[PDB]
Write a protein that binds this ligand. Structure first.
Ligand code: HEM
Length: 154
């Protein structure tokens, strides 16, 4: 898979909007993921005690982790597909430490797209969506490759 320059520009255009409230987005994205796919919460020792949306929104630590996740993702997308060095420490931790199947990266991808629509009603069109989808798909495929490289079936 390869994106056009056009597609990458739309991805980065949308990302600047995320970077205006990273905490806000990172918080909503984690919560969306936890709500839609509750089995993902169980992977988080620090958070799995959070039963409901209202509890999740009042956790400062969940908000902080959202910043962590979006910071790393942002550094990756900014590379426009030349992201191998950024991917390695990430593939390493999520494969060997955290034990996250690739299927869960598809779920958080869907969460990101949803939050982007919720947070940017008039901004985020069919085209930007198509671009973000391809960018996230690229990330998922290349991280799946790095899992296999480390000996893991993602
Ligand atoms: C765009 C997707 C993702 C990015 C960029 C990302 C990034 C990160 C980063 C930077 C960390 C902290 C350092 C590390 O442990 O590697 C982290 C920790 C973690 N990630 Fe992810 N992650 C992603 C998706 C997921 C998903 C889908 C799950 C589980 C369903 C997951 C589970 C975890 C866990 C359990 C930790 C350790 C959290 C802690 O207790 O501090 N990640 N992730």
């Amino acid at each position: 898979m390869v994106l056009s320059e056009g597609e990458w520009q739309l991805v980065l255009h949308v990302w600047a909007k995320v970077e205006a409230d990273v905490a806000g987005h990172g918080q909503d994205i984690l919560i969306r993921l936890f709500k839609s796919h509750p089995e993902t919460l169980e992977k988080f020792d620090r958070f799995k005690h959070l039963k409901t949306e209202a509890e999740m929104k009042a956790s400062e630590d969940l908000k902080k982790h959202g910043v962590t996740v979006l910071t790393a993702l942002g550094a990756i997308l900014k590379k426009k597909g030349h992201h191998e060095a950024e991917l390695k420490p990430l593939a390493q931790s999520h494969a060997t430490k955290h034990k996250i199947p690739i299927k869960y990266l598809e779920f958080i991808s869907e969460a990101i797209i949803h939050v982007l629509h919720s947070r940017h009603p008039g901004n985020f069109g069919a085209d930007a969506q198509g671009a973000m989808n391809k960018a996230l798909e690229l990330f998922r495929k290349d991280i799946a490759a790095k899992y296999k490289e480390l000996g893991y079936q993602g």
